[PDB]
Coordinates of C-alpha atoms and ligand atoms in Angstrom, one line a residue:
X1 CA -18.0 -2.3 43.9
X2 CA -18.3 -4.9 46.7
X3 CA -21.0 -4.5 49.2
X4 CA -22.0 -6.5 52.3
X5 CA -24.6 -9.0 51.3
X6 CA -26.5 -9.3 54.6
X7 CA -26.9 -7.2 57.7
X8 CA -26.0 -10.1 60.0
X9 CA -22.8 -10.8 58.0
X10 CA -22.0 -7.1 58.2
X11 CA -22.5 -7.0 61.9
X12 CA -20.5 -10.2 62.4
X13 CA -17.7 -9.0 60.2
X14 CA -17.4 -5.8 62.1
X15 CA -17.6 -7.7 65.4
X16 CA -14.9 -10.1 64.1
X17 CA -12.9 -7.0 63.2
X18 CA -13.2 -5.6 66.8
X19 CA -13.1 -8.9 68.8
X20 CA -9.6 -10.3 68.8
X21 CA -6.4 -11.1 70.7
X22 CA -6.9 -7.7 72.4
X23 CA -10.1 -9.2 74.0
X24 CA -8.4 -12.3 75.4
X25 CA -4.8 -11.2 75.7
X26 CA -4.5 -7.5 76.1
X27 CA -7.5 -6.6 78.3
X28 CA -6.9 -9.1 81.2
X29 CA -3.3 -7.9 81.5
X30 CA -4.2 -4.3 81.2
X31 CA -6.9 -4.7 83.8
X32 CA -4.7 -6.6 86.2
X33 CA -1.7 -4.3 85.9
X34 CA -3.8 -1.3 86.8
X35 CA -5.5 -2.5 90.0
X36 CA -8.2 -4.6 88.3
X37 CA -11.4 -2.7 89.2
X38 CA -9.5 0.6 89.1
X39 CA -9.1 0.0 85.4
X40 CA -12.9 -0.3 84.9
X41 CA -14.1 3.2 85.9
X42 CA -11.8 4.9 83.4
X43 CA -12.5 2.1 81.0
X44 CA -16.2 2.7 80.9
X45 CA -15.8 6.4 80.6
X46 CA -13.4 5.9 77.7
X47 CA -15.9 3.7 76.0
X48 CA -18.7 6.3 76.3
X49 CA -16.7 9.4 75.5
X50 CA -14.3 8.1 72.9
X51 CA -14.9 4.5 71.8
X52 CA -18.6 5.0 70.8
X53 CA -18.3 8.5 69.3
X54 CA -15.2 7.5 67.2
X55 CA -16.9 4.3 66.2
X56 CA -19.8 6.2 64.5
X57 CA -17.5 8.8 63.0
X58 CA -15.4 6.1 61.3
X59 CA -18.5 4.3 60.0
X60 CA -19.7 7.6 58.4
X61 CA -16.4 8.3 56.7
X62 CA -16.2 4.7 55.4
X63 CA -19.8 4.8 54.0
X64 CA -19.3 8.3 52.7
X65 CA -16.1 7.4 51.0
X66 CA -17.4 4.2 49.7
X67 CA -20.2 5.9 47.9
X68 CA -17.6 7.8 45.8
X69 CA -15.6 4.6 45.2
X70 CA -12.9 5.2 47.9
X71 CA -12.4 3.0 51.0
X72 CA -9.2 4.4 52.5
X73 CA -8.2 7.6 54.3
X74 CA -5.7 9.2 51.8
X75 CA -8.6 9.7 49.3
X76 CA -11.4 10.0 51.9
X77 CA -9.4 12.7 53.8
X78 CA -9.2 14.6 50.5
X79 CA -13.0 14.4 50.0
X80 CA -13.8 15.8 53.4
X81 CA -10.9 18.2 53.3
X82 CA -9.6 19.5 50.0
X83 CA -5.9 19.9 50.8
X84 CA -2.7 18.1 49.7
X85 CA -1.9 17.8 53.3
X86 CA -5.0 15.7 53.9
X87 CA -3.8 13.0 51.6
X88 CA -0.4 12.8 53.4
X89 CA -2.2 12.6 56.7
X90 CA -4.3 9.9 55.0
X91 CA -1.2 7.8 54.6
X92 CA -1.4 6.8 58.3
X93 CA -4.7 5.2 57.4
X94 CA -2.7 2.7 55.3
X95 CA 0.5 2.7 57.3
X96 CA -0.9 2.2 60.8
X97 CA -3.0 -0.9 59.9
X98 CA -0.3 -2.4 57.8
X99 CA 2.4 -2.1 60.5
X100 CA 0.0 -3.6 63.0
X101 CA -0.8 -6.6 60.8
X102 CA 2.9 -7.3 60.4
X103 CA 3.5 -8.3 64.0
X104 CA -0.2 -9.2 64.8
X105 CA -0.4 -11.9 62.2
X106 CA 2.8 -13.3 63.7
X107 CA 1.3 -13.5 67.1
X108 CA -1.7 -15.0 65.5
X109 CA 0.5 -17.8 64.0
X110 CA 1.7 -18.7 67.5
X111 CA -1.8 -19.5 68.6
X112 CA -2.2 -21.7 65.6
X113 CA 1.1 -23.5 66.3
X114 CA 0.2 -24.0 70.0
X115 CA -3.3 -25.1 69.0
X116 CA -1.9 -27.7 66.6
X117 CA 0.7 -28.9 69.1
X118 CA -1.9 -29.1 71.9
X119 CA -4.3 -31.2 69.8
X120 CA -1.6 -33.7 69.0
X121 CA -0.4 -33.7 72.6
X122 CA 3.1 -32.4 71.7
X123 CA 3.2 -30.4 75.0
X124 CA 5.5 -30.3 78.0
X125 CA 4.7 -32.6 81.0
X126 CA 5.2 -30.9 84.4
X127 CA 5.9 -33.0 87.5
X128 CA 2.7 -34.1 89.4
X129 CA 3.2 -28.8 92.9
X130 CA 5.7 -25.9 92.9
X131 CA 4.7 -22.8 90.9
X132 CA 8.1 -22.4 89.3
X133 CA 8.4 -26.1 88.4
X134 CA 5.1 -26.1 86.5
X135 CA 5.6 -22.7 84.7
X136 CA 9.3 -23.4 83.7
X137 CA 8.5 -26.2 81.3
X138 CA 6.0 -24.0 79.6
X139 CA 8.2 -20.9 79.5
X140 CA 10.7 -23.3 77.8
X141 CA 8.1 -24.4 75.2
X142 CA 7.3 -20.8 74.3
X143 CA 10.9 -19.6 74.4
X144 CA 11.9 -22.5 72.1
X145 CA 9.0 -21.9 69.8
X146 CA 9.8 -18.2 69.0
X147 CA 13.6 -18.7 69.5
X148 CA 14.2 -16.3 72.4
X149 CA 17.9 -15.4 72.6
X150 CA 20.1 -17.6 74.8
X151 CA 22.8 -14.9 74.4
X152 CA 23.5 -11.2 74.8
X153 CA 22.9 -10.5 71.1
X154 CA 19.2 -9.5 70.3
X155 CA 18.5 -12.1 67.7
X156 CA 15.5 -14.4 67.6
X157 CA 16.0 -17.9 66.1
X158 CA 12.4 -19.3 65.9
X159 CA 11.9 -23.0 65.1
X160 CA 11.0 -24.5 61.8
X161 CA 7.5 -25.2 63.0
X162 CA 6.9 -21.6 63.9
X163 CA 8.2 -20.3 60.6
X164 CA 6.1 -22.9 58.7
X165 CA 3.0 -22.2 60.7
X166 CA 3.5 -18.5 59.9
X167 CA 3.4 -19.4 56.1
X168 CA 0.2 -21.4 56.7
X169 CA -1.3 -18.5 58.7
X170 CA -0.5 -16.1 55.8
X171 CA -2.0 -18.6 53.4
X172 CA -5.2 -18.9 55.5
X173 CA -5.4 -15.1 55.6
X174 CA -4.9 -14.7 51.9
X175 CA -7.5 -17.5 51.1
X176 CA -10.2 -15.6 52.9
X177 CA -9.2 -12.2 51.5
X178 CA -8.9 -13.3 47.9
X179 CA -12.6 -14.3 47.7
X180 CA -13.5 -10.7 48.7
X181 CA -15.9 -9.0 51.0
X182 CA -19.2 -10.8 50.6
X183 CA -17.9 -14.3 49.7
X184 CA -14.7 -14.0 51.8
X185 CA -14.7 -11.9 54.9
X186 CA -18.5 -12.2 55.3
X187 CA -18.8 -16.0 54.9
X188 CA -16.0 -16.6 57.4
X189 CA -17.4 -14.1 59.9
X190 CA -20.7 -16.0 60.1
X191 CA -19.1 -19.3 60.8
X192 CA -16.2 -17.9 62.9
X193 CA -18.1 -15.6 65.4
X194 CA -20.5 -18.3 66.6
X195 CA -17.7 -20.8 67.0
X196 CA -15.7 -18.2 68.9
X197 CA -18.5 -17.4 71.3
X198 CA -19.3 -21.0 72.0
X199 CA -15.6 -21.8 72.7
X200 CA -15.3 -18.8 75.0
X201 CA -18.4 -19.6 77.0
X202 CA -17.3 -23.2 77.5
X203 CA -13.8 -21.9 78.7
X204 CA -15.5 -19.4 80.9
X205 CA -17.7 -22.1 82.3
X206 CA -14.8 -24.5 82.8
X207 CA -12.7 -21.8 84.4
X208 CA -15.3 -21.1 87.0
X209 CA -15.1 -24.7 88.2
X210 CA -11.4 -24.2 88.9
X211 CA -10.9 -24.6 92.7
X212 CA -7.7 -24.6 94.7
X213 CA -6.3 -24.0 98.2
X214 CA -4.9 -20.7 96.8
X215 CA -8.4 -19.5 95.8
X216 CA -11.3 -19.7 93.3
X217 CA -12.3 -18.1 90.0
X218 CA -14.8 -16.0 91.9
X219 CA -11.9 -14.5 93.8
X220 CA -10.5 -13.3 90.4
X221 CA -13.8 -11.8 89.3
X222 CA -14.3 -9.8 92.5
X223 CA -10.8 -8.3 92.0
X224 CA -11.6 -7.3 88.4
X225 CA -15.1 -5.9 89.2
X226 CA -14.4 -4.3 92.6
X227 CA -13.6 -0.6 92.0
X228 CA -11.0 1.5 93.8
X229 CA -11.4 5.3 93.7
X230 CA -7.9 6.2 94.7
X231 CA -6.5 4.7 91.6
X232 CA -8.7 6.8 89.3
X233 CA -6.7 10.0 90.0
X234 CA -3.5 8.7 88.4
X235 CA -2.9 9.7 84.8
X236 CA -1.4 6.3 84.0
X237 CA -4.6 4.3 84.5
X238 CA -6.5 6.6 82.2
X239 CA -3.8 6.3 79.6
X240 CA -4.0 2.5 79.7
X241 CA -7.8 2.5 79.7
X242 CA -8.0 4.7 76.6
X243 CA -5.2 2.8 74.9
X244 CA -7.2 -0.4 75.3
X245 CA -10.4 1.1 74.0
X246 CA -8.8 2.3 70.7
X247 CA -7.0 -1.1 70.3
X248 CA -10.1 -3.2 71.1
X249 CA -12.6 -1.2 69.0
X250 CA -10.0 -1.0 66.2
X251 CA -10.3 2.7 66.2
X252 CA -7.7 5.0 64.6
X253 CA -6.3 2.2 62.4
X254 CA -8.4 3.2 59.4
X255 CA -9.7 -0.4 59.4
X256 CA -13.3 0.4 60.4
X257 CA -13.4 2.9 57.6
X258 CA -12.5 0.4 54.9
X259 CA -15.1 -2.0 56.2
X260 CA -17.7 0.7 56.3
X261 CA -17.0 1.8 52.8
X262 CA -18.6 -1.5 51.7
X263 CA -21.9 -0.6 53.3
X264 CA -24.5 0.7 50.9
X265 CA -24.9 4.5 50.8
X266 CA -28.2 4.8 52.7
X267 CA -27.7 1.7 54.8
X268 CA -27.8 2.3 58.6
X269 CA -24.5 2.7 60.4
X270 CA -25.8 4.1 63.7
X271 CA -27.4 0.9 65.1
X272 CA -25.1 -1.4 63.2
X273 CA -22.1 0.4 64.6
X274 CA -23.5 0.2 68.1
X275 CA -24.2 -3.5 67.9
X276 CA -20.7 -4.4 66.7
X277 CA -19.2 -2.3 69.5
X278 CA -21.6 -3.8 72.0
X279 CA -20.6 -7.3 70.9
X280 CA -16.8 -6.5 71.4
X281 CA -17.3 -5.1 74.9
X282 CA -19.4 -8.2 75.9
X283 CA -16.7 -10.4 74.5
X284 CA -13.9 -8.3 76.1
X285 CA -15.2 -8.0 79.7
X286 CA -17.7 -10.8 80.0
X287 CA -15.5 -13.4 78.2
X288 CA -12.0 -12.0 78.1
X289 CA -11.8 -10.9 81.8
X290 CA -13.3 -14.2 83.0
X291 CA -10.9 -16.7 81.5
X292 CA -7.4 -15.3 81.9
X293 CA -7.6 -13.4 85.2
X294 CA -9.8 -15.8 87.4
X295 CA -7.8 -18.8 86.2
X296 CA -4.5 -17.4 87.5
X297 CA -6.2 -16.1 90.7
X298 CA -7.6 -19.5 91.6
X299 CA -4.2 -21.3 91.3
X300 CA -2.0 -18.4 92.5
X301 CA -4.0 -15.9 94.4
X302 CA -4.6 -12.2 93.5
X303 CA -1.1 -10.9 94.3
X304 CA 0.7 -13.5 92.2
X305 CA -1.7 -13.1 89.3
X306 CA -1.1 -9.3 89.3
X307 CA 2.6 -10.2 89.3
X308 CA 2.0 -12.6 86.4
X309 CA 0.2 -9.9 84.4
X310 CA 3.1 -7.5 85.1
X311 CA 5.7 -9.9 83.8
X312 CA 4.6 -10.0 80.2
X313 CA 1.9 -9.6 77.6
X314 CA 2.2 -13.2 76.5
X315 CA 3.1 -14.8 79.9
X316 CA -0.5 -15.2 81.0
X317 CA -1.8 -16.3 77.6
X318 CA 1.0 -18.6 76.5
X319 CA 2.7 -19.7 79.7
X320 CA 0.5 -19.4 82.8
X321 CA -2.9 -20.4 81.5
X322 CA -1.5 -23.5 79.6
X323 CA 0.4 -24.5 82.8
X324 CA -2.7 -24.0 84.9
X325 CA -4.7 -26.1 82.4
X326 CA -2.0 -28.9 82.5
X327 CA -2.9 -29.7 86.1
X328 CA -6.6 -30.0 85.3
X329 CA -8.2 -33.1 83.8
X330 CA -8.2 -32.9 80.0
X331 CA -6.0 -29.9 80.4
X332 CA -4.2 -30.3 77.1
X333 CA -7.4 -30.5 75.2
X334 CA -8.6 -27.4 77.1
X335 CA -5.4 -25.7 76.1
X336 CA -6.2 -26.5 72.5
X337 CA -9.6 -24.8 72.8
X338 CA -8.1 -21.8 74.3
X339 CA -5.4 -21.4 71.6
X340 CA -8.0 -22.3 68.9
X341 CA -10.3 -19.6 70.2
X342 CA -7.4 -17.1 70.1
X343 CA -6.6 -18.2 66.5
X344 CA -10.1 -17.5 65.3
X345 CA -10.2 -14.2 67.2
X346 CA -6.9 -13.1 65.6
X347 CA -7.8 -14.5 62.2
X348 CA -10.9 -12.3 62.0
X349 CA -8.9 -9.2 63.0
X350 CA -5.9 -9.7 60.8
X351 CA -7.9 -9.9 57.6
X352 CA -9.4 -6.5 58.6
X353 CA -5.9 -5.2 59.1
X354 CA -4.8 -6.0 55.6
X355 CA -8.0 -5.0 53.8
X356 CA -7.2 -1.2 53.9
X357 CA -4.0 -1.8 51.8
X358 CA -6.0 -4.1 49.6
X359 CA -8.8 -1.6 49.2
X360 CA -6.3 1.2 48.4
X361 CA -4.7 -0.8 45.6
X362 CA -8.0 -1.7 44.1
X363 CA -9.6 1.7 44.7
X364 CA -6.8 4.0 43.8
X365 CA -4.3 2.1 41.6
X366 CA -7.2 0.1 40.0
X367 CA -5.6 -3.3 40.8
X368 CA -7.6 -6.6 40.7
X369 CA -8.4 -8.3 44.0
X370 CA -6.1 -11.2 43.2
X371 CA -3.1 -8.9 42.7
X372 CA -4.1 -6.5 45.5
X373 CA -4.3 -9.4 48.0
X374 CA -1.2 -11.2 46.8
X375 CA 1.0 -8.1 46.8
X376 CA -0.3 -7.1 50.2
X377 CA 0.4 -10.5 51.5
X378 CA 4.0 -10.2 50.1
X379 CA 4.7 -6.9 51.9
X380 CA 3.3 -8.2 55.2
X381 CA 5.1 -11.5 54.9
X382 CA 8.4 -10.0 54.0
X383 CA 8.2 -7.2 56.6
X384 CA 7.3 -9.8 59.3
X385 CA 10.8 -11.1 59.2
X386 CA 12.0 -8.2 61.3
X387 CA 9.5 -9.2 64.0
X388 CA 10.5 -12.8 63.7
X389 CA 14.3 -12.4 63.9
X390 CA 14.9 -9.1 65.6
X391 CA 14.3 -9.0 69.4
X392 CA 12.0 -6.2 70.6
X393 CA 11.2 -5.1 67.0
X394 CA 7.6 -6.2 67.7
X395 CA 7.3 -3.9 70.7
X396 CA 8.6 -1.0 68.7
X397 CA 6.0 -1.4 66.0
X398 CA 3.3 -1.9 68.6
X399 CA 4.2 1.3 70.4
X400 CA 4.4 3.5 67.3
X401 CA 1.4 2.1 65.3
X402 CA -0.6 0.3 68.0
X403 CA -0.3 3.0 70.6
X404 CA 0.8 6.5 69.8
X405 CA -0.2 6.4 66.1
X406 CA -3.9 5.5 66.7
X407 CA -4.6 8.2 69.3
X408 CA -3.2 10.8 66.9
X409 CA -5.1 9.4 64.0
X410 CA -8.4 9.2 65.9
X411 CA -8.2 12.8 66.8
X412 CA -7.1 13.8 63.4
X413 CA -10.0 12.1 61.6
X414 CA -12.4 13.5 64.2
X415 CA -11.2 17.0 63.6
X416 CA -11.2 16.7 59.8
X417 CA -14.7 15.1 59.9
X418 CA -16.2 17.6 62.3
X419 CA -14.3 20.9 62.5
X420 CA -12.9 21.1 59.0
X421 CA -15.7 19.3 57.2
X422 CA -18.4 21.0 59.4
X423 CA -20.0 19.5 62.4
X424 CA -23.6 19.7 61.0
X425 CA -22.7 18.0 57.7
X426 CA -20.9 15.4 59.7
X427 CA -24.0 14.9 61.9
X428 CA -26.4 14.4 58.9
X429 CA -23.8 12.0 57.4
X430 CA -23.7 9.9 60.5
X431 CA -27.4 9.8 61.4
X432 CA -28.6 9.5 57.8
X433 CA -30.2 6.2 56.9
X434 CA -29.9 5.1 60.5
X435 CA -32.5 2.6 62.0
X436 CA -32.1 4.8 65.1
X437 CA -30.8 8.3 65.6
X438 CA -27.7 9.1 67.6
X439 CA -28.6 10.7 70.9
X440 CA -28.5 14.5 70.7
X441 CA -26.0 14.6 73.6
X442 CA -23.3 12.8 71.5
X443 CA -23.3 15.7 69.0
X444 CA -21.7 17.8 71.7
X445 CA -19.4 15.0 72.9
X446 CA -18.0 14.5 69.4
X447 CA -17.6 18.2 68.7
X448 CA -16.2 19.2 72.0
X449 CA -15.7 16.6 74.7
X450 CA -13.9 13.9 72.6
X451 CA -11.4 16.1 71.0
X452 CA -10.6 18.0 74.2
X453 CA -10.4 14.7 76.1
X454 CA -7.9 13.2 73.5
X455 CA -5.8 16.4 73.2
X456 CA -5.2 16.5 76.9
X457 CA -4.4 12.8 77.0
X458 CA -1.8 13.2 74.3
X459 CA -0.2 16.2 76.0
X460 CA 0.0 14.3 79.4
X461 CA 1.3 11.3 77.4
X462 CA 3.9 13.4 75.7
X463 CA 5.3 14.9 78.9
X464 CA 6.2 11.7 80.6
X465 CA 6.8 9.3 77.7
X466 CA 8.5 11.7 75.2
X467 CA 11.6 12.0 77.3
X468 CA 12.0 8.3 77.0
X469 CA 11.9 8.1 73.2
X470 CA 15.6 8.2 72.0
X471 CA 16.8 9.3 75.5
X472 CA 17.8 5.7 76.3
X473 CA 17.1 2.5 74.4
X474 CA 19.0 -0.2 72.5
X475 CA 20.3 0.9 69.1
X476 CA 18.5 -2.0 67.4
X477 CA 15.2 -0.1 67.8
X478 CA 16.5 2.1 65.0
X479 CA 16.4 -0.8 62.6
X480 CA 12.6 -1.1 63.2
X481 CA 12.1 2.7 63.1
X482 CA 14.1 3.0 59.9
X483 CA 12.1 0.2 58.3
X484 CA 8.6 1.5 59.2
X485 CA 9.6 5.0 58.3
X486 CA 10.6 3.6 54.9
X487 CA 7.1 2.0 54.7
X488 CA 5.5 5.3 55.3
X489 CA 7.6 6.8 52.5
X490 CA 6.8 3.9 50.2
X491 CA 3.1 4.3 50.9
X492 CA 3.4 8.1 50.3
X493 CA 4.9 7.2 46.9
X494 CA 1.9 5.0 45.9
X495 CA -0.5 7.8 46.9
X496 CA 1.6 10.0 44.6
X497 CA 1.2 7.5 41.8
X498 CA -2.5 7.2 42.5
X499 CA -3.1 11.0 42.3
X500 CA -1.1 11.2 39.0
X501 CA -2.7 8.2 37.4
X502 CA -6.0 9.8 38.2
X503 CA -4.8 13.0 36.5
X504 CA -4.0 11.1 33.3
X505 CA -7.4 9.5 33.4
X506 CA -9.0 12.8 33.9
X507 CA -7.3 14.4 30.9
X508 CA -8.6 11.3 29.0
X509 CA -12.2 12.5 29.2
Ligands
BOG601 C1 10.5 -18.1 52.1 C2 11.5 -17.0 51.8 C3 12.9 -17.5 51.8 C4 13.3 -17.9 53.3 C5 13.5 -16.6 54.1 C6 14.8 -16.7 54.9 C7 14.6 -16.9 56.4 C8 13.9 -18.1 56.7 O1 14.8 -19.1 57.2 C9 14.2 -20.0 58.1 O2 14.2 -19.4 59.4 C10 13.7 -20.3 60.4 C11 13.6 -19.5 61.7 O3 15.0 -19.1 62.1 C12 14.5 -21.5 60.5 O4 14.0 -22.4 61.6 C13 14.5 -22.3 59.2 O5 15.4 -23.4 59.3 C14 15.0 -21.3 58.1 O6 14.9 -22.0 56.8
BOG602 C1 0.3 -28.1 60.2 C2 1.5 -28.8 59.6 C3 2.7 -28.5 60.4 C4 3.9 -29.4 59.9 C5 5.1 -29.1 60.7 C6 6.4 -29.3 59.9 C7 7.6 -28.8 60.6 C8 8.3 -29.8 61.5 O1 9.6 -30.2 60.9 C9 10.4 -30.9 61.8 O2 11.3 -29.9 62.4 C10 12.2 -30.5 63.3 C11 13.1 -29.4 64.0 O3 13.7 -28.7 63.0 C12 13.1 -31.5 62.6 O4 14.0 -32.1 63.5 C13 12.3 -32.5 61.9 O5 13.2 -33.3 61.0 C14 11.3 -31.9 61.0 O6 10.4 -32.9 60.4
BOG603 C1 15.4 -9.3 59.5 C2 15.2 -10.6 58.6 C3 16.3 -11.6 59.0 C4 16.4 -12.7 57.9 C5 17.6 -13.5 58.0 C6 17.4 -14.9 58.6 C7 18.3 -15.9 57.9 C8 18.6 -17.1 58.8 O1 20.0 -17.2 59.0 C9 20.4 -18.6 59.0 O2 19.6 -19.3 59.9 C10 19.9 -20.7 59.9 C11 18.9 -21.4 60.8 O3 17.7 -21.6 60.1 C12 21.3 -20.9 60.4 O4 21.6 -22.3 60.4 C13 22.3 -20.1 59.5 O5 23.6 -20.2 60.2 C14 21.9 -18.7 59.4 O6 22.7 -18.1 58.3
LIG604 N1 -9.1 -4.7 67.6 C1 -8.3 -5.9 67.5 C2 -6.9 -5.6 67.1 C3 -6.8 -4.5 66.1 C4 -6.2 -3.3 66.3 N2 -6.3 -2.5 65.1 C5 -7.0 -3.3 64.2 C6 -7.4 -3.0 62.9 C7 -8.1 -3.9 62.2 C8 -8.5 -5.1 62.8 C9 -8.1 -5.4 64.1 C10 -7.4 -4.5 64.8 C11 -8.4 -6.8 68.8 O1 -9.1 -6.4 69.7 O2 -7.7 -7.8 69.0
NA605 NA1 -11.3 -6.3 70.7
NA606 NA1 -11.0 -10.8 65.4

C-alpha cells in the first residue's frame, strides 16, 4: 500500500488539500458579508472548538483505517463500529467529496481559462473612471465565458474555450492522480505550495500599494480585523463562521481521512495535523483576507466592497479584482498571477476531492490505480455537465454536499469515533506515535463541547433554513437533487458489491 515518502511532502500535501479556492474566494466574501471583524470572533472560536478537534479525529481514523488496508469511511466506519448502518453512513464519505469535486473542478477550470487569457492579453479594455463602466466589461467577459442565460430559461451555454479548458483541467488532475500518492500528489505538493505562497505574498504586497481617493488597502484590513461585539449575538454569523471552517479545513468530506490512511501506522498525526491546519489558517486570513477585501476597499470604499461581497461568490474574484487590476500598471499580468494562484490552490484541493473515490475502488473493489483514476475522472467529468449547462445546479450541489452534508458528517464521525468506539480508545489512537501530545483539555472538547456545539448549530440551522427547502424554489433544482440522490444510490451499490466480493474471498480461504 502507498505511503507518504517524506514528512514535508505529507505536510505540504495536507496543506494543499486544505488551502484552496476557499482561502482566496470564500473567506473574504464570508468575512465581508458578516461585518468583517464580526466574522472573526466566531471564526476563531470555531477553529479552536471544531476545526482543530475534528482535524485530529480525521487523521486518527485515516491512519487507523490505513493500517488495515482501508482508506474510506464505508469500511472505516465498520471497523470502529460493527454495524451494517455504519457502512451506509460511510457512503457520505464517498458521496460528499465526489459531489464537491464535480462543481469545484469546474470553478477550478475557470481560473485556468482566465489565467491563460490574461497571459495572452485576451482581456476586455475598460475606458480610461465610472465604477459601472469598468466592471461591466468584466462582467461581460465572465458571463460570456460560462454562458450565463440571456433568456428566461435556466440554461447555460458556456463557450468552446471554457469547455475545452475543462477537459484540460480534468487531464491535469488525472495526470497527477495517476502517478499515485508519493510520486503524484506528493511531488506536486512540494512544487505547488511554495509557488502558491510566493505568488500570494507578491499579490498581498502589490495590493498594499493600491492607493485611491476612495481609500487604501489599510482601510480594508482595519475593517476585517476590527471586531464588533453586537454582531456576535446573531446565529447567522456563527453559522457562516462554522461553515467556512469545515470548508477550509476540508473537514467532514472524508478527504482528510483518505490522505491520512497513507500515513504509516505509528507515524505522528498530532503535530503533523496541527501544522497543516496552521498553514491553511495563515494562508486564509493572512493571505486570503489581504488580497480580495483590501483591493476592493481601496478602489470602492468599505460600504461598496461589502456590497460587492454580497452580490456574488465569484463577483469579487472574477469580476471586481480583475477590473481593479486593469486600472493599475501591468494590471493584466497581475490578473494572471491572481488567477494562476487560484488555479494552483484549486488544483491541489481537487485531487484531494477525487482521491477518496479512487481509494475506495482500489481498497474495496481491488482496482488498479490506472482504472480507479480513469473511471473516477469519467464520473466526475460526465456529472460536471449538469453544473456546466444547468443554471443554479452548482449552488444546489454546494448547499447539500458543501454545507449541510459536511456538518452532519463531521458530527457523525465524531460520535462514531468517540462515543460508539469509546473515548479512551479514540484518545490513545489519536495521541499514539505523536511527536507531541494533544492537550488534556481537548479530550473534553472532543467528547463533550464539540458534539454539543455542532448539534445545537444544526438544530438552529434546521429551524430557519429547513422551511426553505422545497417550500419555494425553481423546479430545476430537482434535476440536481435527483441526480445526486442517484449518485448516493450508485455508491451504495458499489459498497454492496465490495462487501459481497469480500465474502467470496473470505470463503476462499
Ligand atoms: C466530450 C463528450 C461529448 C461532448 C459532450 C456534449 C456537450 C459538449 O458540447 C459542447 O458544449 C460547449 C458548451 O456549450 C459548446 O461550446 C461546444 O460547441 C459543444 O461542442
Ligand atoms: C490552452 C489551449 C486552449 C486552446 C483554445 C481553443 C478553443 C478556441 O477555439 C476558438 O473558439 C472560437 C469561438 O467558438 C471560434 O470562433 C474559433 O474558430 C476557435 O478557434
Ligand atoms: C445536462 C447536460 C447537458 C448536455 C447537453 C449539451 C448539448 C449541447 O447542445 C447543443 O449545443 C450547441 C452549442 O455547442 C448548439 O449549437 C446546439 O443547438 C445544441 O443542440
Ligand atoms: N478545503 C478546500 C475545499 C474543499 C472542501 N472539501 C474538500 C475536500 C478535499 C479537498 C478540498 C476540499 C478549500 O479551502 O478551498
Ligand atoms: Na482552505
Ligand atoms: Na488546494
